[PDB]
Design a protein around this nucleic acid. Structure first.
Ligand SMILES: [Mg+2]
Ligand SMILES: [Mg+2]
Ligand SMILES: [Mg+2]
Ligand SMILES: [Mg+2]
Ligand SMILES: [Mg+2]
Ligand SMILES: [Mg+2]
Ligand SMILES: [Mg+2]
Ligand SMILES: [Mg+2]
Ligand SMILES: [Mg+2]
Ligand SMILES: [Mg+2]
Lengths: 129, 55, 56, 106, 88
RNA sequence: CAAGCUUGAGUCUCGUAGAGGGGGGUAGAAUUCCAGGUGUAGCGGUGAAAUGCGUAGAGAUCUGGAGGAAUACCGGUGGCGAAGGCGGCCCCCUGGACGAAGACUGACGCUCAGGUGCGAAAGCGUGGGGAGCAAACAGGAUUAGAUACCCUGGUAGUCCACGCCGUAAACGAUGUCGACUUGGAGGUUGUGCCCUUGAGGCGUGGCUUCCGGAGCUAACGCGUUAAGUCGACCGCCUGGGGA
């Protein structure tokens, strides 16, 4: 079943990028929007849009640099089957710092760098590079 | 539309020996070749059509 | 196959007409097939093999 | 109520019982709140192949709308009756009242 | 399966109206009626293993619906089982 | 924890295709047998034979009858089923799938150790049934031998009822459910639309076959029915032999 909506969003991005698709649409959620924000603010996607009221649909405009997709790798870390939580000092850095780790902290969803600056820890949602 | 009573139309889809003619020869649709075969068998039982070219 | 010899038609033509009626009805083919027992697995294997051959 | 197309063929030596059979069959259907839509006495007809050393037999078509109880006793009365050499009751999705190709080919 | 007239009768008896067809009480009663009717079929046709699989699906579906109603409204469940004469 | 929400999952209405299951009828071909007509010296079988059958009249042919088992053609990389498997025709009882349009319930869902049920053939028990086929067994051959392959026979068994057994290369050698990712040609089964239609034109679902792109793979190959990209849960593997 649809037990992991977050891994689905990442897979929709991953497959869309591989299929040279201009955009990817999926059923929306606050958490999907919070991740979409971090992806846009770090230049992994162009822009995101939430259409509808009763059945919200999140659309993400994919980014393509030159002959290639911007998102090289996008993997789910913490998942329903095994939750990954890290302390401020244990926070992981993707590509030795050249990539981002989406962390869910007490003060919201942000990058590994952001949480490190804010002295926070949390659930490691995904790795993006 | 197909009926065992219409031995007029039925006689076109059976051979000289009484055998049902395959869809590959008659060019009929799959759904209706099945409907035909049932009608030919229904008409055969009721002695409206023969089984073999002996009787 | 029931063949009726026509008026002023030679015997050679009537026999050739009969041989073609038997060829059409598959007389010798149905006898070859029924001579010996064939397992359901074997007739299913033959049907699959012939369907593959009917692709050129 | 279900729809049925009954076809029974009577021995030619008993072709006189046929009107009496029709009267009785119709009475059992109408008696059980059932309806009769088509009835066609085809009379003596030539058989495609012989059945019980016979060539020719009396045919009767019937398109009925009746409960499964009277259609069951109709099926048994055909087995029990020696006059009926063959019968076939076929369930139909809807009632039919149109000249069958037997009425039309004459 | 269960007749148009028989199904409609159950919908009225257990539903909020004639159109409240999805109500758990309606659903459980429609399954109860068919499970009970089929008892007669499987008494004569004990070797009908294929149809029995479909009956067991009705039984397992009823159980899942009954357990759902038990946690959502204990009173509505207590009434429903007493109304159709079932333990659990 | 509380209240919801309708997209997941169900319920309802009308239909559609199907060897899906259980029961009861019934039909025509053929084999064997019995009974009779005609007929006369062979038939049958094989690589060749012989065993075997036939002057108590076979085989061949025609007619009548008994009985069992299986359903030619249709028939199709056709269809249905969870798998095993399911095929003449008719009815009765019944399970599933799919489509169209709305309405209803409101996360009721997915998976599943243990548990439970089903489960080809052979085999087992009791009573039936027994035409054909045929383990065993007998005879005739082949061969250096021939406990075989071939031939003539033939018992269990194969068939039915009720129990049992619980296994197969039980295979797609591919666990189930869900989401996402270029295409081409067919087959099958729904349905919306358009024409003067004794057919086609344009869509939109379910299933299925061949080919193939990316990707994947040790390769072979797989390729929207994945063996691709991901997630949930389960089963299982850890060198060969021993086992
Ligand atoms: Mg049904
Ligand atoms: Mg016979
Ligand atoms: Mg509501
Ligand atoms: Mg036994
Ligand atoms: Mg032998
Ligand atoms: Mg024994
Ligand atoms: Mg095993
Ligand atoms: Mg390739
Ligand atoms: Mg391929
Ligand atoms: Mg070892």
């Amino acid at each position: 079943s649809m037990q992991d909506p977050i891994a689905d969003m990442l897979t929709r991005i991953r497959n869309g990028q591989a299929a040279n698709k201009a955009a990817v649409t999926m059923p929306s959620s606050k958490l999907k929007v919070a991740i979409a924000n971090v992806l846009k603010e770090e230049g992994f996607i162009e822009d995101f849009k939430v259409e509808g009221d009763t059945k919200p649909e999140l659309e993400l405009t994919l980014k393509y640099f030159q002959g290639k997709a911007v998102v090289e790798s996008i993997q789910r870390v913490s998942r329903p089957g095994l939750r990954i939580y890290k302390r401020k000092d244990e926070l992981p850095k993707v590509m030795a710092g050249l990539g981002i780790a989406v962390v869910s902290t007490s003060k919201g969803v942000m990058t590994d760098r952001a949480a490190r600056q804010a002295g926070l820890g949390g659930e490691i949602i995904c790795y993006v590079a | 539309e197909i009926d065992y009573k219409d031995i007029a139309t039925l006689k076109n889809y059976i051979t000289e020996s009484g055998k049902i003619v395959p869809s590959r020869i008659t060019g009929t649709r799959a759904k209706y070749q099945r409907q035909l075969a049932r009608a030919i068998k229904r008409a055969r039982y009721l002695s409206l059509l023969p089984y073999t070219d002996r009787h | 196959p029931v063949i009726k010899v026509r008026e002023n038609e030679p015997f050679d033509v009537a026999l050739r007409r009969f041989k073609r009626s038997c060829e059409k009805a598959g007389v010798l083919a149905e006898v070859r097939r029924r001579e010996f027992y064939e397992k359901p697995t074997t007739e299913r294997k033959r049907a699959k093999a012939s369907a593959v051959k009917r692709h050129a | 109520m279900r729809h049925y197309e009954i076809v029974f063929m009577v021995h030619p030596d008993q072709s006189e019982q046929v009107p009496g059979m029709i009267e009785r069959y119709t009475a059992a259907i109408t008696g059980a709140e059932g309806k009769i839509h088509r009835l066609e006495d085809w009379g003596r007809r030539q058989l495609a192949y012989p059945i019980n050393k016979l060539h020719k037999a009396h045919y009767v078509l019937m398109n009925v709308e009746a409960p499964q109880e009277v259609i069951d006793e109709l099926e048994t009365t055909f087995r029990f009756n020696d006059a009926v050499i063959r019968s076939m009751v076929m369930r139909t999705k809807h009632a039919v009242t149109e000249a069958s190709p037997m009425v039309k080919a004459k | 399966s269960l007749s148009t007239e028989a199904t409609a009768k159950i919908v009225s008896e257990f539903g909020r109206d004639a159109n409240d067809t999805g109500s758990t009480e309606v659903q459980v009663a429609l399954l109860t009626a068919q499970i009970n009717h089929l008892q007669g079929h499987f008494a004569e046709h004990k070797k009908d293993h294929h149809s029995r699989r479909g009956l067991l699906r009705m039984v397992s579906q009823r159980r899942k619906l009954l357990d759902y109603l038990k946690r959502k409204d204990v009173a509505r469940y207590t009434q429903l089982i007493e109304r159709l004469g079932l333990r659990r």
